[PDB]
Design an enzyme around this catalytic site. Structure first.
Site, PDB file in Angstrom:
ATOM      1  N   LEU H  41      34.106   6.371 -80.644  1.00 22.86           N
ATOM      2  CA  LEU H  41      33.809   7.715 -81.606  1.00 22.86           C
ATOM      3  C   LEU H  41      34.335   7.258 -83.320  1.00 22.86           C
ATOM      4  O   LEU H  41      35.124   7.083 -83.278  1.00 22.86           O
ATOM      5  CB  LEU H  41      33.689   9.012 -81.585  1.00 22.86           C
ATOM      6  CG  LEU H  41      33.156   9.933 -81.221  1.00 22.86           C
ATOM      7  CD1 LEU H  41      31.637   9.978 -81.171  1.00 22.86           C
ATOM      8  CD2 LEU H  41      33.005   9.389 -79.823  1.00 22.86           C
ATOM      9  N   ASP H  42      32.887   6.646 -84.337  1.00 25.52           N
ATOM     10  CA  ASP H  42      32.760   6.460 -85.316  1.00 25.52           C
ATOM     11  C   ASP H  42      33.860   7.394 -86.236  1.00 25.52           C
ATOM     12  O   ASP H  42      34.607   8.516 -85.731  1.00 25.52           O
ATOM     13  CB  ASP H  42      32.207   6.665 -86.280  1.00 25.52           C
ATOM     14  CG  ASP H  42      30.972   5.137 -85.863  1.00 25.52           C
ATOM     15  OD1 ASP H  42      31.935   4.000 -85.602  1.00 25.52           O
ATOM     16  OD2 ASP H  42      29.867   5.027 -86.788  1.00 25.52           O
ATOM     17  N   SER H  43      34.312   7.057 -87.643  1.00 22.46           N
ATOM     18  CA  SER H  43      35.304   8.044 -88.478  1.00 22.46           C
ATOM     19  C   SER H  43      34.320   9.432 -88.695  1.00 22.46           C
ATOM     20  O   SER H  43      34.748   9.727 -88.784  1.00 22.46           O
ATOM     21  CB  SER H  43      35.388   6.845 -89.515  1.00 22.46           C
ATOM     22  OG  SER H  43      35.766   5.800 -89.692  1.00 22.46           O
ATOM     23  N   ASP H  45      32.170  10.455 -86.708  1.00 23.37           N
ATOM     24  CA  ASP H  45      31.756  11.008 -85.846  1.00 23.37           C
ATOM     25  C   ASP H  45      32.551  12.054 -85.138  1.00 23.37           C
ATOM     26  O   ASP H  45      31.718  13.092 -85.136  1.00 23.37           O
ATOM     27  CB  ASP H  45      31.291  10.694 -84.922  1.00 23.37           C
ATOM     28  CG  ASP H  45      30.076   8.698 -84.875  1.00 23.37           C
ATOM     29  OD1 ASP H  45      29.962   8.880 -86.520  1.00 23.37           O
ATOM     30  OD2 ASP H  45      29.467   8.870 -84.121  1.00 23.37           O
ATOM     31  N   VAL H  46      33.899  11.505 -84.893  1.00 21.67           N
ATOM     32  CA  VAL H  46      34.727  12.844 -84.775  1.00 21.67           C
ATOM     33  C   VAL H  46      35.265  13.431 -85.934  1.00 21.67           C
ATOM     34  O   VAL H  46      35.499  14.610 -85.497  1.00 21.67           O
ATOM     35  CB  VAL H  46      36.071  11.772 -84.887  1.00 21.67           C
ATOM     36  CG1 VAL H  46      37.363  11.330 -86.117  1.00 21.67           C
ATOM     37  CG2 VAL H  46      37.251  12.173 -83.860  1.00 21.67           C
TER      38      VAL H  46
END
Ligand SMILES: CCCCCCCCCCCCCCCCCC(=O)OC[C@H](COP(=O)([O-])OCC(O)COP(=O)([O-])OC[C@@H](COC(=O)CCCCCCCCCCCCCCCCC)OC(=O)CCCCCCCCCCCCCCCCC)OC(=O)CCCCCCCCCCCCCCCCC
Ligand SMILES: CCCCCCCCCCC(CCCCCCCCCC)(CO[C@H]1O[C@@H](CO)[C@H](O[C@@H]2O[C@@H](CO)[C@H](O)[C@@H](O)[C@@H]2O)[C@@H](O)[C@@H]1O)CO[C@H]1O[C@@H](CO)[C@H](O[C@@H]2O[C@@H](CO)[C@H](O)[C@@H](O)[C@@H]2O)[C@@H](O)[C@H]1O
Ligand SMILES: CCCCCCCCCCCCCCCCCC(=O)OC[C@H](COP(=O)(O)OCCN)OC(=O)CCCCCCCCCCCCCCCCC
Ligand SMILES: CCCCCCCCCCCCCCCCCC(=O)OC[C@H](COP(=O)(O)OCCN)OC(=O)CCCCCCCCCCCCCCCCC
Ligand SMILES: CCCCCCCCCCCCCCCCCC(=O)OC[C@H](COP(=O)(O)OCCN)OC(=O)CCCCCCCCCCCCCCCCC
Ligand SMILES: CCCCCCCCCCCCCCCCCC(=O)OC[C@H](COP(=O)(O)OCCN)OC(=O)CCCCCCCCCCCCCCCCC
Lengths: 82, 54, 481, 56, 90, 50, 106, 85
Positions: H41-43, H45-46
């Site tokens: 998960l991206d920065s 996205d989390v």
């Protein structure tokens, strides 16, 4: 703090209420409804305006007219049945 | 059904003291008024002995 | 009797070692004796009744049965009987409010407290300017010693204030009394309304009397000693100072000033109204920024005294009745508030800073209920004698000057503000982190508070119950042609 | 004696009667001011109220 | 050679009492604030701001009230006044 | 003060021995509420204008 | 002001969370909130790779200004939290023993 | 009234992550899975996921505590640490 708001704004109203009661007792010699309504139509109009203005400021605070409304919405801090 | 807290006696010392004094005061008031209707004057007035005005 | 009773005192002291039970018994007997006097007091007569003279040349150690009066005169009318009843109601409570918190040198402490009470009681019996002045001053050294030895951390400055300010005003009163003495060659209160001085001399004598009134009431701007003295005093000192001693000034206005200097008083009334309005407004606003509980309570008394002044100088029967009723109701309620802040909280925590106190309702619901009741009594909630006194005083003030009394009506709000601001923080919120849980109010503390609340409620519901002692008084002092 | 009684009562939480330090605090606890304030002072105040009522 | 009498026996002065547990946990910051607030008179000085407050409350406001109270003395009578009647006397 | 930090007195949002300003009574939690969305001057403009 | 660092990440993530909170506060309709949220994520994605300092600092300052222009008068808070209608209601008492203050009297 | 259990919290979070479309795989979601590493998960996205979690259990995560949760077990222990949720 909401309670302090309500009690203080309505004490402002009550201060003007006491002013009105003093004027009424001085002018009419009494606080009874019967006597005041008996003789009010003969009374000087400036005195009647003074009395009614004080009483209206009191009612304004009690009935939350736009002068002294702020406590009415703060009162929603109390429980809903209140 | 909600829980139960320990039993507590209805007539506390404060209940007895305040009810007793208040009811006794009212009883005394009525006795004085009745004694006044019969005798002519309140029974409390009889203990009043001021010097005369003159 | 006196010999035998002195033997009784001596033996009790030898065996018990603590004089306080004897003092409580003596004061309770004094209250009963005053009630017996009230039973035998004639109300259909405006003349002084239980008269006696002390230190007459024919009988220096006895009562005077001589045809020449050169001693000190004493006697009572209805006005003085009212304040005497207040005094003898209060004295045993001031003994009982320090029953357990005085431990070192307690016999001297109780002796000082009882002596101060007895001096004030005698002051209300005085029937001439010199006897009045003597009993007026005699409290000052007793208060000085009591505050210096048994007061809190700042009690040296406080003892010096309570001596020096009151002496300062009293000496100008003394100038006035000397002038009256040499100009009239009489000093008594029985016939002093029969002497009509020239208007100019009246105007001069009034100034000395009123300077003393200004310091003793107190009024703005010479009030700043009272918060210090109240804050540093032990509890009995505060109770006597707020409940009784301040009432001596109102009594002095009625007894010493109005009957003798009537015309000058008429001339000076607008200046009095300026001073009283300043007192009410400015001291009420200054209370909002105080951080000491006892200081806040002390500041409250000054504003109520301003309202009483406005009533008593209104030249109306309603105003004078309201001033007296307000004095009595304040004498009930203010000692109760001082009991709460300097007797209950201070004996549990030994601190008076407002930041430390919050949310006392959790562990001490009874004390919180007392606080709420006494607060709404102090701000003049109706059915309390405080409301009757304030309402009648404001009526008289408004009649005397509609603008000034009308503006005075803001005191309702201002008092509500400072008092309810204190009680809101004292009762609400989460229990404070700085203090540990203590006992709720004790049986003795509740007894004292209950006495005071019942008294204020009884005169609040039916203020007319004082009229049988005061109906001559509400006409004796007004000046209308 | 007073020092011993009150210190035991204050530390242990037990009354020094019954004779070994019983816990029974419920009742049987009269203070040294009660008799005076309840049988002299309070009746005096009641009498004053009655007198004022009938004097009025 | 000049000394107090040997016949005198001095002990310590103890006021006695029961040391209760400390129910208050003192905060030094609050105590310092309270000390500064309580003894403010010892540090007061006349500056522009404090002088302005002095002039408003000890001079101006008394003068306004005094003007009002000496101008309106005896001016009003209200008891039972009727229509057309003057409520003023001057 | 952000109310998710932790304080010795959570309700007052104060920590022990924290210094007090001389006018601390006007800035503590029991002081009158302060409104952030508008500046006081602009709010005055809006109220008068309404 | 780093183009890619832990502090920069913390800042941008805090800010993107702020943007989503703001959008939820402002938009009543759920569908449109999802619309605007998707668009916010797109705007946040496009400027992701800005490397040189002046442009990044400028974009951060201007997005801060945008957020400040769109602040809500009263955010939605759950009732049990600081701004909540139930915050500190019926706070259970500390359990605590009675400290005595007087030798003779409770 | 209503009371949640540790397993109820876990089941809700797992269904929540299963609903997310940016995830790598659904079968690979563990209690101790790392969103940054395992789920990729991206920065941002989390962040979206933490926001979903707070919108699901009705609580309010501060900035400092939001960025601290890196694993699903961390999320679960945080959500069970909060009395009103
Ligand atoms: C009408 C007649 C009323 C007249 C007065 C009656 C009051 C009697 C009081 C009493 O019982 O004695 C207690 C009193 C000592 O109190 P205490 O109970 O021992 O307190 C210690 C403990 O608290 C006691 O134990 P505790 O600690 O466990 O108690 C906790 C505390 C609670 O803790 C608190 O927080 C207290 C909060 C403050 C309470 C204080 C305010 C009290 C308010 C009264 C109630 C208000 C009601 C609303 C208005 C209603 C009006 C009627 O309890 C209280 O103190 C409050 C008691 C309330 C009891 C109410 C229950 C009444 C029963 C009703 C039964 C009805 C029967 C109907 C049957 C019908 C059949 C036909 O001793 C006295 O007798 C004092 C005598 C005072 C007489 C009046 C003074 C008059 C003279 C003053 C001067 C005259 C005017 C001034 C003139 C100035 C100079 C000229
Ligand atoms: C009337 C017209 C008066 C005009 C003068 C204003 C006055 C009198 C106030 C008296 C009020 C009396 C009321 C009582 C009842 C009357 C019926 C108060 O001026 C005050 O203004 C205040 C606000 O500006 C200042 O407070 C703070 O200040 C700053 C700190 O950081 C902050 O900027 C501010 O924010 C703070 O608040 C004070 O420092 C200042 O004293 C005096 O101000 C001026 O007069 C001179 C000469 O004597 C004084 O001495 C001068 O400076 C001395 C070294 O400095 C040396 O000796 C010498 O160089 C020289 O001699 C100074 O005092 C000067 O300033
Ligand atoms: C037309 C003008 C209308 C004026 C109305 C009268 C004003 C007095 C009312 C004072 C008051 O209500 O303040 C209460 C205040 C609570 O306000 P707040 O903190 O916002 O409540 C939070 C709850 N949600 O809590 C407080 O701030 C109490 C602290 C003191 C408040 C009064 C300070 C004196 C200021 C002068 C008041 C009015 C003076 C006479 C007019
Ligand atoms: C150091 C300060 C300055 C000191 C200067 C003044 C010192 C005075 C010393 C106190 C003594 C005064 C009190 C005792 C005098 C009253 C004695 C008396 O009998 O009063 C006479 C009066 C009329 O009595 P009679 O004419 O004889 O007729 C009786 C018919 N059965 O009978 C009555 O009507 C009763 C009168 C009751 C008066 C109430 C007195 C209340 C206070 C009594 C003790 C006060 C002690 C004060 C101690 C501190 C010092 C001030
Ligand atoms: C600073 C502190 C200053 C302190 C000031 C206190 C001064 C106190 C002076 C005392 C004189 C006032 C006494 C009040 C008079 C009360 C009384 O009458 O006592 C009885 C007796 C005289 O009584 P008699 O004259 O017969 O009148 C009653 C008739 N029914 O009276 C007597 O027989 C005399 C007994 C009193 C002796 C006092 C001795 C001084 C104190 C030692
Ligand atoms: C109305 C005015 C009220 C405000 C002015 C109060 C007087 C005053 O200005 O302060 C007292 C002053 C000495 O204090 P000052 O130097 O002014 O201030 C120190 C720091 N602000 O006092 C002085 O300036 C000294 C004046 C002394 C004059 C004494 C007069 C004779 C006294 C009886 C002999």
């Amino acid at each position: 703090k909401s309670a302090l708001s309500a009690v203080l704004m309505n004490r402002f109203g009550d201060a003007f209420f006491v002013l009105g009661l003093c004027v009424i007792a001085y002018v009419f010699g009494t606080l009874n409804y019967s006597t005041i309504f008996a003789t009010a139509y003969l009374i000087n109009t400036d005195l009647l305006v003074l009395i009614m203005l004080a009483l209206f400021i009191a009612a304004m605070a009690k009935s939350a007219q736009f002068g002294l409304h702020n406590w009415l919405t703060l009162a929603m801090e109390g429980p809903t049945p209140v | 059904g909600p829980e139960l807290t320990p039993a507590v006696p209805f007539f506390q010392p404060y209940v007895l003291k305040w009810a007793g004094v208040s009811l006794g005061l009212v009883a005394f008031y009525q006795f004085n008024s009745s004694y006044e209707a019969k005798n002519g004057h309140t029974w409390v007035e009889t203990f009043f002995h001021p010097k005369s005005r003159e | 009797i006196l010999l035998s009773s002195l033997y009784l005192f001596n033996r009790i002291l030898a065996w018990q070692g603590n004089v306080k039970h004897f003092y409580l018994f003596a004061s309770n007997l004094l209250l009963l004796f005053i009630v017996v006097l009230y039973i035998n007091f004639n109300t259909f007569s405006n003349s002084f009744q239980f008269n006696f003279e002390l230190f007459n040349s024919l009988n220096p150690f006895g009562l005077s049965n001589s045809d020449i009066s050169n001693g000190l005169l004493f006697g009572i009318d209805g006005l003085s009987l009212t304040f005497i009843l207040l005094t003898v109601l209060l004295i045993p409570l001031t003994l009982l409010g320090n029953w357990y918190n005085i431990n070192f040198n307690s016999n001297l402490y109780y002796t000082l407290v009882l002596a101060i009470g007895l001096v004030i009681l005698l002051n209300f019996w005085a029937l001439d300017y010199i006897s009045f002045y003597i009993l007026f001053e005699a409290t000052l050294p007793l208060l000085f010693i009591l505050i210096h030895i048994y007061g809190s951390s700042d009690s040296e400055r406080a003892s010096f204030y309570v001596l020096m300010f009151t002496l300062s005003g009293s000496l100008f009163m003394l100038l006035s009394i000397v002038v009256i003495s040499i100009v009239l060659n009489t000093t008594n209160f029985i016939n002093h309304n029969l002497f009509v001085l020239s208007l100019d001399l009246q105007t001069i004598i009034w100034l000395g009397l009123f300077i003393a009134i200004m310091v003793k009431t107190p009024l703005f701007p010479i009030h700043v000693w009272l918060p210090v003295v109240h804050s540093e005093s032990p509890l009995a000192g505060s109770m006597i100072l707020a409940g009784l001693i301040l009432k001596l000034a109102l009594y002095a206005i009625l007894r010493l000033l109005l009957p003798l200097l009537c015309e000058a008083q008429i001339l000076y009334t607008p200046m009095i109204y300026i001073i009283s309005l300043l007192t009410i407004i400015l001291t009420s606003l200054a209370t909002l920024r105080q951080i000491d509980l006892k200081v806040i309570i002390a500041y409250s008394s000054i504003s109520h005294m301003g309202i009483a002044i406005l009533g008593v100088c209104s030249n109306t029967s309603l105003g004078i009745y309201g001033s007296i009723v307000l004095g009595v109701a304040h004498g009930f309620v203010s000692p109760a508030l001082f009991l709460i802040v300097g007797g209950i909280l201070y004996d549990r925590y030994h601190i008076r800073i407002v930041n430390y106190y919050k949310g006392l309702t959790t562990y001490m619901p009874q004390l919180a209920t007392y606080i709420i009741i006494l607060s709404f009594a102090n701000i003049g909630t109706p059915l309390t004698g405080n409301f009757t006194g304030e309402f009648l005083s404001l009526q008289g003030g408004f009649i005397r000057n509609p603008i000034i009394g009308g503006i005075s009506c803001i005191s309702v709000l201002l008092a509500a503000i400072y008092q309810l601001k204190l009680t809101n923080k004292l009762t609400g919120g989460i229990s404070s982190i700085y203090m540990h849980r203590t006992n709720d109010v004790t049986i003795r503390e509740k007894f004292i508070m209950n006495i005071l609340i019942i008294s204020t409620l009884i005169i609040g519901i039916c203020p007319q119950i004082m009229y049988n002692l005061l109906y001559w008084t509400v006409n004796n002092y007004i000046y209308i042609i | 004696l007073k020092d011993y009684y009150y210190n035991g009562r204050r530390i242990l939480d037990k009354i020094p009667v019954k004779v070994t330090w019983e816990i029974k605090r419920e009742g049987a606890e009269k203070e040294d001011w009660v008799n005076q304030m309840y049988f002299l002072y309070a009746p005096s105040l009641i009498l004053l109220l009655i007198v004022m009522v009938y004097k009025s | 050679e000049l000394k107090p009498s040997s016949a005198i026996q001095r002990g310590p002065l103890n006021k006695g009492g029961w040391d209760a547990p400390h129910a208050l946990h003192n905060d030094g910051a609050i105590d310092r604030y309270a000390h500064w607030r309580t003894f403010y008179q010892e540090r007061f000085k006349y500056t522009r701001a404090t002088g302005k407050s002095t002039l408003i409350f000890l001079v101006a406001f008394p003068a306004l009230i005094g003007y009002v109270a000496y101008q309106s003395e005896g001016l009003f009578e209200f008891a039972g006044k009727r229509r057309g009647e003057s409520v003023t006397t001057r | 003060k952000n109310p998710y930090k932790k304080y010795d007195d959570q309700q007052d949002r104060r920590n022990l021995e924290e210094p007090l300003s001389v006018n601390d009574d006007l800035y503590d939690m029991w002081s009158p509420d302060r409104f952030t969305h508008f500046k006081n001057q602009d709010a005055l403009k809006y109220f008068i204008g309404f | 002001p780093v183009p890619f660092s832990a502090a920069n990440k913390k800042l941008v993530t805090s800010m993107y969370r702020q943007s989503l909170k703001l959008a939820r506060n402002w938009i009543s309709n759920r569908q449109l909130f999802r619309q605007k949220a998707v668009e916010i994520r797109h705007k946040f994605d496009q400027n992701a790779q800005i490397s040189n300092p002046r442009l990044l600092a400028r974009t951060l300052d201007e997005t801060r200004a945008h957020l400040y222009e769109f602040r809500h008068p009263d955010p939605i808070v759950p009732p049990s939290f600081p701004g909540g209608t139930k915050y500190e209601r019926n706070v259970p008492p500390r359990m605590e023993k009675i400290m005595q203050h007087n030798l003779y009297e409770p | 009234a209503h009371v949640l259990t540790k397993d109820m919290i876990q089941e809700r979070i797992v269904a929540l992550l299963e609903s997310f479309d940016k995830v790598n795989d659904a079968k690979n979601i563990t209690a101790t899975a790392n969103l940054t590493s395992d789920l990729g998960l991206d920065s941002l996205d989390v962040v979206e996921v933490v926001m979903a979690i707070e919108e699901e259990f009705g609580l309010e995560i501060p900035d400092h505590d939001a960025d601290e949760i890196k694993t699903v077990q961390q999320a679960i222990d945080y959500v069970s640490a909060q009395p009103a949720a």
